[PDB]
Structure 1
């Protein structure tokens, strides 16, 4: 390849191929001249080394270097390795009809919608646009249409809004760790340069919006569009293939909103009134005549499908709030009422979605997830649920607890001076009393936060779980924990050295007071331990997942039943204390191997070849069986495959 100038760019193969012909034709000359034996011997050795460097350079003693003192790349070095032909040009590759950009939120989309910049859709779908500027006669040839798009006339829009109508595009995020990292959304053309990305798919993608980028690919052919719609469409993926757990889980603002809404305060704007339905609850909240946390008696009609798939209504008069009745306007028909008649944290609404999915199917759940999203966003914005400094409330007893523990470490120091305790005993006692003090400060601050708000109940006075902001967004599981809320208002704890040994004087402050110059140096030990860790950890999990994909890489379900009477003996796992995993989880969705005998022994409880399901596990629990022979994949008798029965439930469908 000609570099910039008259010169010629170096190619290592040509260097090796010239080094070979030199210690060649020269040797041919020497064998023509019949030169002495030793000089021709050395020339033959140089030919041997030239060939050994040409084929596999470096497998010898010392790799020869052409320039810059860097071993030049032989033939066997463009075939192997991460930069070889196999892993670089022949297992993954650069791709046309594709682009990338920065993702922003777009909380108005629906699960099947992304928002493409109006300038990136006109570049991906360019030939699709030519094939309509040429079919409508708005142009005549490919040059007319090419310029027609180049100058972006006002007609290469909606032509573009039509080549885009029901044509999905794939949206890939950089480390595609699992398969949910490629999902196909329908595009919505937006003004801008950021790829707006529905909030409920961020969990699957593992994508915050702090600056990470996505890659759109365009499925050209027709089977690729029906695959992107019937297999990859972000709607078809509301369960995880790794476990039967949901993956469309509302998080961190949809749940602070649904929590602030569905919660009670023991007094409010209207706390007695008896409403006449959810619509009147909304009409009252919106008018400012009732508080979203009031305690009203609503009259709700809930549907239940106890019939053979038929919904029968029941109208009752429930004790709820105004918010839990405003929210019952989005819950589909079929779900009970005691699904919103609580204070919904993150788990409560993830379980509400997970029960909608199993009672009403997939389409009501895909419609319910967007409703939950919009109505959690609305009522989280409508609440102003901010965070200030007076919200991290330090306990009144933190000074006393810390002074007590300080006096106790001084007492143990006095015990050590007299020699009644050795070094290790002293250290362990000091660690123990400081850990007990940390626990006491944690409990003090948590009691002070949680039960704090005391409010006059229209009688004398009364306690109630608090409306503290940081406590709300910790208790609702929105974003927070107890460890963190404790490093903010309680004490920060016992920090460990880089090797692992605990420092025997704990950080006794928090980020609402200040850390010392030394308390903040002590913290950086374990702050950089757990960053060097996550930087040295990705390059090591990626290699494991690559070796795992390459070991299996071909286990396609090539039969429907292998007819085996083998299997494993699924039993609830127990290590000595609590049951680590019940039988229902370890046996669900799998095909039994032998008929499980009820402890009414000699009567078959379950047949021999039944995929179980939720209810069959319930029935195994009633008769309280504790060992089921189940058909596993490691006992299948098919060849070059696995029968669909020795696998079981799909776990995603």
Structure 2
């Protein structure tokens, strides 16, 4: 084909075919005129070289030609070793607090360009545009009423969002298209954790389900409401993140006194008291009438009114909780790990619709309460310990005595660095423990008569004790001190970073810390690609089998027990057997109890605790065994999915 202003663009196969045709034509002419043995045989070898080069160059020499130094692309090279698709796009991500779980903010211009054919068909069907060309002219010059038609087109038509690094099945998720005045794609904060997405300039791609079955597949399977629980583990994938959990943590935290008292009320009426001032928020152990609701044996709902000693925030947050559940005790704890556990228990007890609405209510209440709290990060938040200089001087004195001992023989000078590193590591633990103990408790308050203690409301401590991106090591590095820094050779340095991020940092220690940052970024780059490399081999081997033949027989299987490191370490884990089909009535201290092929339910797994700690061994059907031919038994597999 001719390019721009002459200069044709031909393939390498044309040169290979021309060379083979020229050599074969000369060989045909040679077998006609005078036939020399050397000339005819050499031309036959040249024809073999041309035919071999045309089929697959590759190995022997590689026939160059055609000006360029690189080899010609043969037929074998063309098929030896990323599918672009229409009706798609991409844009920069953004937070969208007001949106629901099954919703995503699509741009007005992007959604108009995406649904072009649907807008043209819907326009011509109703009226307005006389033909398809008129709808194209009407859509090109955006004339107000076309936007109203675009609202009808994307009413119940799911759009499939997608991130770059698609690790799991949750990378691609569908949502109902909401029109937003802007050039950036909004997204729900709850589902951001599933994609591993942050708002640091990351962009996501959108895809429109054209077919009717494709739209049903996006709604039934690929929708965000359906994907509640994770595929890998049974716990909730779309649990409350940093901002929501910090607000729910602020909604708990029972502070004594300070506009407190035991002013009684009845649930919802406490919301009027909170907005109208007078009483504080997380004040005292205030009593209130809690209308609980529970069920057992025959289902239904059974009321249970009672006066429980909660807080004002726990009383207000109790309205967000559903019809079922234990009630009170969920809100009475806190917001850190049990926030996810409350959503998991609500999903198991109630269902999909109740848990989805509760997740949206918890996200909205968490964001609103976090805004009202106003948790900041000042300079005085990270309070340094008074015994940091004393502990550093004492550790340096011990290291100086060890070095003084090594100067006059006595101890082993070959392994003195290991013992000196233990002294510095012990000093780092002392600084971390002293900083943690001071920053955790602290405070004074005024409980009626004045003189008490509870817990420090110091922002970073509140962030650290409620998920919210705040570990013990990061807080120790800020206020306390950075521990044993790694060197380029592999060994650890004998003089750790005594200073911290709050205080000033020297040029020597910062230069040493640069090796850890450089090695951390380099290792993260290698491990990220290496994980996908391992996943490609795992997917290539595994992606043939599927669950088929309904449910075959076969009793035998792996005897499931708790992963015991308790032989000489104290470590138990009895949460493996859950949603797994039983092999056959697996005994009981007496008789009966367990069924043949009864799947161990979430509530039925709790019933295993009723049989005491003696019963810690149950035979269960697994995917390793099973008498299926070319697939897997549905009973033998289990259940563990979003559903």
TM-score by length of 2: 0.95
- Whole-Å separation in 1 of the counterparts to 2:518 and 2:231: 34
**Residue 645 of structure 1: SS of its match in structure 2?**
helix
Work out whether residues 578 and 605 of structure 2, in 8 Å CA contact, stay in contact via their aligned partners in 1: no
Of 565-574 and 217-226, the range deviating more from structure 2: 565-574
Work out whether residues 278 and 300 of structure 1, in 8 Å CA contact, stay in contact via their aligned partners in 2: no
Work out whether residues 318 and 328 of structure 2, in 8 Å CA contact, stay in contact via their aligned partners in 1: no
- The alpha carbon displacement at 1:289 in A equals 3.7
Work out whether residues 132 and 159 of structure 1, in 8 Å CA contact, stay in contact via their aligned partners in 2: yes
Work out whether residues 565 and 571 of structure 2, in 8 Å CA contact, stay in contact via their aligned partners in 1: no
Work out whether residues 263 and 342 of structure 1, in 8 Å CA contact, stay in contact via their aligned partners in 2: no
CA offset digits 1:186-209 (Å, max 9, x no partner) = 011000011100000001111111
Work out whether residues 291 and 304 of structure 2, in 8 Å CA contact, stay in contact via their aligned partners in 1: yes
Work out whether residues 285 and 322 of structure 1, in 8 Å CA contact, stay in contact via their aligned partners in 2: no
CA offset digits 1:144-174 (Å, max 9, x no partner) = 1100000011110111100011111111111
Q: State whether structure 2 residue 460 is matched by structure 1 residue 480.
A: no
- Whole-Å separation in 1 of the counterparts to 2:66 and 2:538: 38
- After superposition, the Cα gap between the structure-2 partners of 1:429 and 1:97, relative to the gap in structure 1 and judged at 3 Å, is same
- After superposition, the Cα gap between the structure-2 partners of 1:377 and 1:173, relative to the gap in structure 1 and judged at 3 Å, is same
- Whole-Å separation in 2 of the counterparts to 1:172 and 1:18: 47
- Whole-Å separation in 1 of the counterparts to 2:529 and 2:213: 36
Work out whether residues 593 and 609 of structure 1, in 8 Å CA contact, stay in contact via their aligned partners in 2: no
- The alpha carbon displacement at 1:603 in A equals 8.4
- Whole-Å separation in 1 of the counterparts to 2:362 and 2:38: 88
Aligned to 1:522: 512
Work out whether residues 275 and 281 of structure 1, in 8 Å CA contact, stay in contact via their aligned partners in 2: no
CA offset digits 1:245-290 (Å, max 9, x no partner) = 2101101000001101211212212333223333224433443543
- Whole-Å separation in 2 of the counterparts to 1:268 and 1:586: 46
Figure out how many residues of one structure are paired with residues of the other and give that number: 643
CA offset digits 1:110-160 (Å, max 9, x no partner) = 000001001111111111111121011211111111000000111101111
- The alpha carbon displacement at 1:65 in A equals 6.0
Work out whether residues 598 and 605 of structure 1, in 8 Å CA contact, stay in contact via their aligned partners in 2: no
TM-score by length of 1: 0.94
Q: State whether structure 2 residue 500 is matched by structure 1 residue 510.
A: yes
Work out whether residues 58 and 64 of structure 1, in 8 Å CA contact, stay in contact via their aligned partners in 2: no
- Whole-Å separation in 1 of the counterparts to 2:70 and 2:346: 63
CA offset digits 1:333-381 (Å, max 9, x no partner) = 2222344443523211111111111111111100000000000000101
Structure 1 unaligned runs (5+)? 82-91
Work out whether residues 334 and 360 of structure 1, in 8 Å CA contact, stay in contact via their aligned partners in 2: yes
Work out whether residues 129 and 163 of structure 1, in 8 Å CA contact, stay in contact via their aligned partners in 2: yes
Of 393-402 and 328-337, the range deviating more from structure 2: 328-337
CA offset digits 1:561-582 (Å, max 9, x no partner) = 2211321121222235478985
- After superposition, the Cα gap between the structure-2 partners of 1:565 and 1:7, relative to the gap in structure 1 and judged at 3 Å, is same
Q: State whether structure 2 residue 274 is matched by structure 1 residue 284.
A: yes
Of 38-47 and 134-143, the range deviating more from structure 2: 38-47
Of 245-254 and 550-559, the range deviating more from structure 2: 550-559
Work out whether residues 598 and 623 of structure 1, in 8 Å CA contact, stay in contact via their aligned partners in 2: no
- Whole-Å separation in 1 of the counterparts to 2:531 and 2:165: 12
Of 330-339 and 508-517, the range deviating more from structure 2: 330-339
- RMSD (Å), alpha carbons: 2.2
- Whole-Å separation in 1 of the counterparts to 2:520 and 2:365: 37
Aligned to 2:631: 641
CA offset digits 1:9-48 (Å, max 9, x no partner) = 2422222222322333233333334353223333333322
- Whole-Å separation in 2 of the counterparts to 1:373 and 1:608: 37
- The alpha carbon displacement at 1:63 in A equals 6.0
CA offset digits 1:537-562 (Å, max 9, x no partner) = 23222222122212122212111222
- Whole-Å separation in 2 of the counterparts to 1:325 and 1:501: 55
Work out whether residues 578 and 600 of structure 2, in 8 Å CA contact, stay in contact via their aligned partners in 1: no
- Whole-Å separation in 1 of the counterparts to 2:437 and 2:546: 55
- Whole-Å separation in 2 of the counterparts to 1:597 and 1:465: 48
- The alpha carbon displacement at 1:616 in A equals 6.9
- After superposition, the Cα gap between the structure-2 partners of 1:620 and 1:9, relative to the gap in structure 1 and judged at 3 Å, is farther
